[PDB]
């Protein structure tokens, strides 16, 4: 009969609520870098959610900040998938 007006949205945030998002001056942001890698490798095999979960692992495990400034040094980041989707999504 009807669907919520807020249905069928996906919000792929680069970072958890409340938090900085990290960008590297030569390779781009941690999130966009990891998202594009994952898409290139998996968009023909994996559903979107599962691509994004691999994005979460990559940002979480492969990146750590480096800064001459102690307060910004050795910091981590976890992206935040926010799904109001009602179906699975395959670019395949």
């Amino acid at each position: 009969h009807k669907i919520p007006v807020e249905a069928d949205f996906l919000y792929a945030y680069s970072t958890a609520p409340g938090y900085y998002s990290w960008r590297n001056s030569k390779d781009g942001s941690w999130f966009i870098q990891s998202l594009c890698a994952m898409l290139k490798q998996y968009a023909d095999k994996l559903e979107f959610m599962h691509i994004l979960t691999r994005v979460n692992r990559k940002v979480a495990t492969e990146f750590e900040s480096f800064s001459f400034d102690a307060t910004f040094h050795a910091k981590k980041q976890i992206p935040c998938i926010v799904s109001m989707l009602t179906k699975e999504l395959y670019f395949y």
């Binding site: 807020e6 949205f9 590297n24 699975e88 999504l89």
Partner: protein
């Protein structure tokens, strides 16, 4: 049935708003590296078969006007929508070159009742922006 129809003639638009250079009034610094991201996204979504449209250094009014215009197109022959936002931000806020704007304002243009050609179609919003000023200190394995 439990899967979005991606068989439409077009996959749909992919809008990338790339905001590197901000007004001195904001106090926000330049966002170096972001051109690599905008370039990266364009190639990626081009292989996902999206009409990619890159836009650069938009004011907060330009963003709202852009998104309202994109909102008013006919997506009848498109499978999905993708909007990418590279900028500074806070919780629920994105920055145009000259100041902040609520994410809700941008997204409400694509609600099921206000964008009838996208109803029941996946609307994707990728946001590369800050959501606050906390830092994750992590923990060891």
């Amino acid at each position: 049935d439990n899967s979005y129809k991606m068989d439409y003639p077009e996959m749909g638009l992919c809008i990338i708003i790339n905001n590197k250079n901000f007004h001195k009034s904001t106090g926000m610094t330049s966002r170096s590296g972001t051109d690599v991201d905008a370039a990266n996204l364009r190639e990626t979504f081009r292989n996902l078969k999206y009409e990619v449209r890159n836009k650069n250094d938009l004011t907060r009014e330009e963003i709202v006007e852009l998104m309202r215009d994109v909102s008013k197109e006919d997506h009848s022959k498109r499978s999905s929508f993708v909007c990418v936002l590279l900028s500074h931000g806070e919780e629920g806020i994105i920055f145009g070159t000259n100041g902040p704007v609520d994410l809700k304002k941008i997204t409400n243009f694509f609600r099921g009742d206000r964008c009838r050609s996208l109803t029941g179609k996946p609307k994707l919003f990728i946001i590369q922006a800050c959501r606050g000023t906390e830092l994750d200190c992590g923990i060891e394995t």
